[PDB]
Design a protein around this ligand. Structure first.
Ligand SMILES: [Zn+2]
Ligand SMILES: [Zn+2]
Lengths: 307, 307
């Protein structure tokens, strides 16, 4: 049985990538009128993390703002050649951190959007975080039967740099599919419902509605699969129709994954059935990720309550 | 019967806006693999219009390339603060026109994607052009039962400064819905089919194939409808879920148009029926067009044959 102190400070970040509109829209709204994210006891703080990128409806200025929160860049000396995102990340790590410190904000919900058919999705940066497993189980249960998938991205060899990683309790709230630079009312309503059930969880966990022991089904990142590309640099094939929009559904070695304009079909291969996520995401053409391979498993969580 | 000169010089323009991926890809494939678009007798030339914007996977560097082909811009002298696209437009013309001259390319197709869900769309610039009306009827027949609607432009403004306006016969090919910065396999297959048939029509037409009179449905643009925008110029409401993804689907004076985050409704009302196009396009919020209203009508073409 775990026992944690009451959560006090909550920051909801929108606009880390200025062209993923949903997060922008809500933070704009809430800042204006904060009744929707008001909860007694909490100091839920909505905040925009890239006005410049949002103001021009673009993803980033110099570099991805979600890749520079590694202490390495946070403790970098200030200059003029300094990337904008860095000049902004250092300010963020100062206002809502410092990263890994008793002063660090308690919870940061960083809102994102994807062009892939992923549906309601939650991101966990630690399979050993019982508080977050309980929050996620609570969200899935409350939103049922509307799915709210959990993407587990943990292995410390690739988990250590994000805007929300300064949070004593970080949470990624992905929401797609949605073309970047577009606002779909349906996606806005879903992102809001996810946040509605999460912020409620925090006030309840406080009120003493101690939670029973339980686990959740999650998708654990295995590895990213790039696009086969010509000796040149540009891709030489396109996501197979049968795979298109099929995030989360098991893939088998012989199932078609890519197809060239000539019509050749490239199957999955390998010897194991995997689950595809972030299939055909626009922002990832440059990161070299046609989709990410993950493994499906269970994560138990000890019963929890507030001190 | 309407006589006609045997079409010869045809161009295929992909990449006017740098992030509309289908064209960027098909024209790149057709420049090396030309057979698909090869029609014995034609000099069919595929061409990438904005390579610098394509290299950055961005709509445009300085200003919209598809809006600077008006006479003033084509003969404009260069100046330090003049948008790059104006200079690129003179080059495109120096190679495929001169616009408005006997030396103008005969048929130039300009490929475009839309984040809107309007299916296959052919853009017609001359409501009295029997040659194009015939080509469009031919394509529609070859694509049936897939929908293939026609967007007709009457106002000179929104058509005389277009990239396709340099040729003798301009043709706009539009395929959605597809988030920019993404390549879907089904969309690639679609646009390429509409084209295969557009080229077959041209070769046959030249080979003397006499085409009898015909008629097609068309949707003529009436006026743009911008998103409601609070004083500060920000978006006050978004496309209603009942209007979202429902392009070409006739609206009525009651069907809700926008929806704010507080749940407000702003139906069309007005004074008649309309056919909402470019409902929630990504490269339009700037233009202040949440969607554009059109009127429905049929165009009849007389019989035609090459001379
Ligand atoms: Zn993102
Ligand atoms: Zn366009």
């Amino acid at each position: 049985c775990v026992a944690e102190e009451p959560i006090k400070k909550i920051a909801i970040f929108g606009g880390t990538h200025g062209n993923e509109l949903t997060g922008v829209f809500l933070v704009t709204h809430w800042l204006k009128n904060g009744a929707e994210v008001h909860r007694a006891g909490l100091e839920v703080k909505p905040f925009i993390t890239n006005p410049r990128a949002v103001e021009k409806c673009t993803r980033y200025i110099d570099c991805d703002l979600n890749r520079v929160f590694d202490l390495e860049n946070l403790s970098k000396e200030m200059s003029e050649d300094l990337p904008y995102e860095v000049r902004r990340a250092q300010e963020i790590n100062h206002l809502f951190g410092p990263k890994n410190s008793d002063d660090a904000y308690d919870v940061v919900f960083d809102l994102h959007n994807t062009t892939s058919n992923m549906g309601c999705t939650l991101i966990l940066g630690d399979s050993g975080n019982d508080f977050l497993i309980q929050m996620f189980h609570y969200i899935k249960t409350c939103m049922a039967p509307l799915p709210c998938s959990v993407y587990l991205i943990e292995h410390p060899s690739l988990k250590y740099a994000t805007t929300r990683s300064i949070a004593k309790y970080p949470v990624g709230i992905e929401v797609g599919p949605q073309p970047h630079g577009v606002l779909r009312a349906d996606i806005l309503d879903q992102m809001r419902r996810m946040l509605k059930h999460a912020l409620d969880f925090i006030q309840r966990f406080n009120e003493g509605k101690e939670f029973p022991p339980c686990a959740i089904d999650v998708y654990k990142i295995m590895e990213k699969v790039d696009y086969p590309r010509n000796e040149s640099g540009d891709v030489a094939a396109v996501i197979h129709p049968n795979l298109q929009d099929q995030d989360w559904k098991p893939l088998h070695p012989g199932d078609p994954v890519f197809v060239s304009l000539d019509g050749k079909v490239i199957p999955l291969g390998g010897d194991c059935t995997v689950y595809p996520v972030f299939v055909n995401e626009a922002a990832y053409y440059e990161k070299k990720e046609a989709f990410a391979k993950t493994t499906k498993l269970t994560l138990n969580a000890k019963s929890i309550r507030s001190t």
